[PDB]
Amino acid sequence: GEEELQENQELIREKSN
C-alpha cells in the first residue's frame, strides 16, 4: 500500500536527539 511515506515521517522523529 503506502508504507514508504509511513516510514519517512518516523525518520523525522529520529532526527530528534
Q: What is the CA radius of gyration of the chain?
A: 9
Q: What number of CA atoms fall less than 13 Å from residue 8's CA on the CB side?
A: 4
Residue 3 annotated as binding site: yes
CA distance 9 to 7: 6
Residue 14 annotated as binding site: yes
Residue 4 annotated as binding site: no
CA distance 12 to 15: 5
Residue 2 annotated as binding site: no
Q: How was this structure determined?
A: NMR
